[PDB]
């Protein structure tokens, strides 16, 4: 059947994907030994979409781990779920990227990409029907950014008809964690906009806001943010694994959600989100999930969507629900807030319903929005990048890896053109 090759790259890649595989193994009843010990047939009905079965009731997650320094991989291998992963797919270098995109893309990635692609081909030839590739990585991180751009280019050349999905951690609007993050982000998007099919933008700052505000958490960790991101990832591909009243694979989402080839970035969201104490005072209904999804404070992206308009909206629900209820809620949303949707797209909302709810919830819903408001992210990145580039800030660190001024110039020009395209598609024109 359809199979997904999950590629992990960078620190975000490794950590987020470790939490992701924890969640996925929990959903399918796979204990840390790889042996199936679940309680339902649907867990094994579509176990092959993310797992390879080695005879002996052991299942191996079809994942590839990529990094340039073995520290994060050692931490992953020694932690929980270390022995389920077949050790063939721990492909790492020795130098590290040093947060330099130029380094990770032209020297260290250039040295390691042959082994990584051989592993990719090994995992792809063993598949029954390769559906798409999922990449978890950060943009500010040099390893993540560079290795991901290189791998995406090479794999797009290798399989031009497969789905290339990426979950990227984007720069924060206030608190940056890397000095050279703007250049890495610019040079990364300069290739992501060309080779990827769709990219989900995750900001750590929005996750912190959700954690302190909604969940009432006082000591949130990167692991809990990874838990939220992993819940989103599991909600995205719930139709590839369990039946439902209305299913939607990855290609259906790509078709319904990308109106024009370059405007493929999406803002993910999740519902329901409650603190532990407040769980006893709020009922779980479809209107509740709908109101939590279409809320500015519940957007995991670093932008208030009320500043622009939406082009496409995807809402995948989980758990037993009424389709009439969901459709009426979507009608109410589109009617009451019609000014937030582009006039040239009638029927802005795409829906899907899976019959299997997440662990511990009666019902949930995953939000995916394509809003012109995301132009704020790209405009801020362009402004910061231009201000830094005028003074040649840290430019020698990248020119020493083989880059010239023309590559930065072309990246910045393409970024300005992308921002201008998003601004162009805010005109009603009718």
């Amino acid at each position: 059947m359809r199979e997904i090759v999950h590629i992990q790259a960078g620190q975000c890649g490794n950590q987020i994907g470790a939490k992701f595989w924890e969640v996925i193994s929990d959903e399918h009843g796979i204990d840390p030994t790889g042996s199936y010990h679940g309680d339902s047939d649907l867990q094994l009905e579509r176990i092959n979409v993310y797992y390879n079965e080695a005879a002996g009731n052991k299942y191996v997650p079809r994942a590839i781990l990529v990094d340039l320094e073995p520290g994060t991989m050692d931490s992953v291998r020694s932690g929980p779920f270390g022995q389920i992963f077949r050790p063939d797919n721990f492909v790492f270098g020795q130098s590290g990227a040093g947060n330099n995109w130029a380094k990770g893309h032209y020297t260290e990635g250039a040295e390691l990409v042959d082994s990584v692609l051989d592993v990719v081909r090994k995992e792809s030839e063993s598949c029954d029907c390769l559906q798409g590739f999922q990449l978890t990585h950060s943009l500010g991180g040099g390893t993540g950014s560079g290795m991901g751009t290189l791998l995406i280019s090479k794999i797009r050349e290798e399989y031009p008809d497969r789905i290339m999905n990426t979950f990227s951690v984007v720069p924060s609007p206030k608190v940056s964690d890397t000095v050279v993050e703007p250049y890495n982000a610019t040079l990364s998007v300069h290739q992501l906009v060309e080779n990827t099919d769709e990219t989900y933008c995750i900001d750590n700052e929005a996750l912190y806001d959700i954690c302190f505000r909604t969940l009432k958490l006082t000591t949130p960790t990167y692991g809990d943010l990874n838990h939220l991101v992993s819940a989103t990832m599991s909600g995205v591909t719930t139709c590839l694994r369990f039946p439902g009243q209305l299913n939607a694979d990855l290609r259906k989402l790509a078709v319904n959600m990308v109106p024009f080839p370059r405007l493929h970035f999406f803002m993910p969201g999740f519902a329901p989100l409650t603190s532990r104490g407040s769980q006893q005072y709020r009922a779980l209904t479809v209107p509740e999930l709908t109101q939590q999804m279409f809320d500015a404070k519940n957007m995991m992206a670093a932008c208030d969507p009320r500043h622009g308009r939406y082009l496409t909206v995807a809402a995948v629900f989980r758990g037993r629900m009424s389709m009439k209820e969901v459709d009426e809620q979507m009608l109410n949303v589109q009617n009451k807030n019609s000014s937030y949707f582009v006039e040239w797209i009638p029927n802005n909302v795409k829906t899907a319903v899976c019959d299997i709810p997440p662990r511990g919830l009666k019902m949930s819903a995953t939000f995916i929005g394509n809003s012109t408001a995301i132009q704020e992210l790209f405009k801020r990145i362009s402004e910061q990048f231009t201000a830094m580039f005028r003074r040649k800030a840290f430019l020698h660190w990248y020119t020493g890896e083989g880059m010239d001024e023309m590559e930065f110039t072309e990246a910045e020009s393409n970024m300005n053109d992308l921002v201008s395209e998003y601004q162009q598609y805010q005109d009603a024109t009718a």
Partner: peptide, 25 residues
Amino acid sequence: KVQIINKKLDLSNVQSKCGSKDNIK
């Protein structure tokens, strides 16, 4: 340096196909 791809679309002059008036005479 881009411009939205807007086209002037029109179904200018479309005639019917069923000859509902062919035997009106």
